[PDB]
Amino acid sequence: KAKVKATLGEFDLRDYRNVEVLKRFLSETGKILPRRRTGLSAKEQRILAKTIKRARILGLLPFTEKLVRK
Amino acid sequence: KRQVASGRAYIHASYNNTIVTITDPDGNPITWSSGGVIGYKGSRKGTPYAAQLAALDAAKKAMAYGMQSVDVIVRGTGAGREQAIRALQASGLQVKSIVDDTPVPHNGCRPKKKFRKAS
Amino acid sequence: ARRRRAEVRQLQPDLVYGDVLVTAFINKIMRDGKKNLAARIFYDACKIIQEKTGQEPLKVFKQAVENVKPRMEVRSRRVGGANYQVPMEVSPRRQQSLALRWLVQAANQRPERRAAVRIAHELMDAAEGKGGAVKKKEDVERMAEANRAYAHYRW
RNA sequence: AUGCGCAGAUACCGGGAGGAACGCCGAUGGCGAAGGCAGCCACCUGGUCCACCCGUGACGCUGAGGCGCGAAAGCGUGGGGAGCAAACCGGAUUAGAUACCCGGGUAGUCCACGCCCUAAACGAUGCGCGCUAGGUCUCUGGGUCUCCUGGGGGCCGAAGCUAACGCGUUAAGCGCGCCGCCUGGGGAGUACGGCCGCAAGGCUGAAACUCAAAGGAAUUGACGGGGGCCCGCACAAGCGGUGGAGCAUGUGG
Numbered sequence A: 001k002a003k004v005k006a007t008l009g010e011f012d013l014r015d016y017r018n019v020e021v022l023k024r025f026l027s028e029t030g031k032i033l034p035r036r037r038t039g040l041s042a043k044e045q046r047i048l049a050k051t052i053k054r055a056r057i058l059g060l061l062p063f064t065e066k067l068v069r070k
Numbered sequence B: 001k002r003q004v005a006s007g008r009a010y011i012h013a014s015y016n017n018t019i020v021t022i023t024d025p026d027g028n029p030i031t032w033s034s035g036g037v038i039g040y041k042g043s044r045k046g047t048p049y050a051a052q053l054a055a056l057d058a059a060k061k062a063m064a065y066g067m068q069s070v071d072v073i074v075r076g077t078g079a080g081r082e083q084a085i086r087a088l089q090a091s092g093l094q095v096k097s098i099v100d101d102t103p104v105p106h107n108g109c110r111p112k113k114k115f116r117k118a119s
Numbered sequence C: 001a002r003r004r005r006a007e008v009r010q011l012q013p014d015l016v017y018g019d020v021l022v023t024a025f026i027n028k029i030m031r032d033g034k035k036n037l038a039a040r041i042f043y044d045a046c047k048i049i050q051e052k053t054g055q056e057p058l059k060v061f062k063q064a065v066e067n068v069k070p071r072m073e074v075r076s077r078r079v080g081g082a083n084y085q086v087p088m089e090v091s092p093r094r095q096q097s098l099a100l101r102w103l104v105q106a107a108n109q110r111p112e113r114r115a116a117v118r119i120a121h122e123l124m125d126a127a128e129g130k131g132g133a134v135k136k137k138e139d140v141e142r143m144a145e146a147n148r149a150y151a152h153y154r155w
Numbered sequence D: 001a002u003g004c005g006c007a008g009a010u011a012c013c014g015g016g017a018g019g020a021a022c023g024c025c026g027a028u029g030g031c032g033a034a035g036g037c038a039g040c041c042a043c044c045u046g047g048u049c050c051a052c053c054c055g056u057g058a059c060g061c062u063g064a065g066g067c068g069c070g071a072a073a074g075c076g077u078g079g080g081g082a083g084c085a086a087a088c089c090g091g092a093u094u095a096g097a098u099a100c101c102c103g104g105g106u107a108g109u110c111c112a113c114g115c116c117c118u119a120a121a122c123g124a125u126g127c128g129c130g131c132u133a134g135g136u137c138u139c140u141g142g143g144u145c146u147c148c149u150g151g152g153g154g155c156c157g158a159a160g161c162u163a164a165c166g167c168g169u170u171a172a173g174c175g176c177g178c179c180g181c182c183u184g185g186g187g188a189g190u191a192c193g194g195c196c197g198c199a200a201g202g203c204u205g206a207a208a209c210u211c212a213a214a215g216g217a218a219u220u221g222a223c224g225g226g227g228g229c230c231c232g233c234a235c236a237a238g239c240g241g242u243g244g245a246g247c248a249u250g251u252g253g
Helices: A019-025 A042-057 B048-063 B081-089 C020-029 C035-050 C057-068 C092-107 C115-127 C132-146
Strands: B006-014 B017-023 B029-034 B069-075 B094-100 C072-075 C086-089
Touching: A019 A042, B006 B048, B006 B081, B017 B048, B017 B081, B029 B048, B048 B081, B069 B081, B081 B094, C020 C035, C020 C057, C020 C092, C035 C057, C035 C115, C057 C092, C057 C115, C057 C132, C072 C132, C086 C132, C092 C115, C092 C132, C115 C132
Parallel strands: B006 B069, B069 B094
Antiparallel strands: B006 B017, B017 B029, C072 C086
16 A cells, blocks of 8 residues: 555644645545554554544544445 | 436345335435345345345336436345345446445444344 | 266267267166167167158257256255255256256156157157157256245355 | 234435434553543543652551442432343244243333442452563653663563463562461351341351362363364265065064
8 A cells, every 4th residue: 555644744633624634544434544554653643533533523524434336 | 207317226235135225316215126025035035136136126117217327325234235236237227336325333322132242 | 086076987989870979878778788789779769760750860869968958957055944956057067967867767758668769759859849858857947947046055 | 923014114315302322543552559441622630650860868668457449230219211121021942942043121221319349359460679681562751862761561481480381570580578368078158146238138257967079280082063184885976776565584572
């Protein structure tokens, strides 16, 4: 694959409004991606999961999507 | 009866049966079918073949309303999922695009002893 | 057959039409290793296909067989509970086996008193496609369809 | 099959109510003395780790009793009640089936307040301190950031220990301090007494009588309605038979 960290420069992963970055961390089913895939560290992924959830409650990110072409 | 050129094909594929409902673009039923709706009874209604018959029945019943293409939406994981899908493809009635939208609680109600055996 | 695949035992060409398929059919006619008496019958019966139709016996023969080969049949199977007649494709070598076996059985089911006749009239009724052999053959094929619902078990 | 459906159910779309639980992240992860703790947000609040080497000056350890906390189920009063589900009502199954499977269903599961105080409450391993090779994975600090250096979590395993299995700087090693506990099996966590509890019951806890054992770990077998991989006319595939008749022969009676 590729690692979703390897696609970006400095981003504040506490910034729960940056949908353009934040969104690249969800699956196509819109679920928080595993670290296997995100390429973040434990500490980081802990803060990400927290920020994404916030985005979600705000309406700026999905809780789920339907899988396309199954 | 009304003309509906295209719309939606819902496959509800359970372990015990497969039902197919076909709807207009807004999701109002046009026709339906199932393993019981074909001749089968009880256990056989499961079976990939029942699924086929049912999908085909539902499609042919629906082409009657001049329906010609559909979006597919599958729900469940069950002996007959993909036969129902291949059947709509092979039914004529052009398959625009398949989506799986099986529901899943974001951890919700305690399940029946049957679906809990993993403690 | 635990170890091997077993070679399709290879037969000795027909000393009169030059056909392995024929010997095969002669053997199926044979009782208690009376191969002589058996061939008398097959040939006397080819006699009764001229004496009754314009075309060549080897041709009626080849054809009768063709009609009697089944394409699907039910094989029995273990599942959690009781058993399932599972339809599946019938391999070429077996198709042949079954055809001949059935022709000979169907033949000796007929009413006419002398063997070569029975063999012949059955051969004839088969290429026309209406012998009791082609019957107990559509019975198989039909029955494999009845059970089309269980064709997801074929090994 | 019971059951539900033409008083139109199942499937499908839209709106609403409600209760309970938080998918992915999620880990071999973290936190807490234990029980235990998982959507998100605020506020109130406990513990703890590192660096600086600044203050006090042995103020320490442990801890009978006391007091507090303590999963589930259960109890009381009042709410709540979606889904699940002892009991219970049915349907199957069965030799029977007061069960396993299926359809229903009350207590209960949920909240508040008050009880109960139990457990395979487990690392089945009390608490503190000092000492005794290393390797590798990991969470979380600091540094001069290959690495070095604290504090957690793991595995492998120096020395050593152990009946063995194992343990091994997270000791079951080498030592000190203090607490708790054991003293063959059954009778019995029973009786009695006391204490506690609204009750259920809890804590404490015998005796007569009786047994030659009860036990732990590992060994070789054998066995499994355990797993892998093999074979035989073992099954399948065939072809001809016995079972039926008459008789021959052996046998039971």
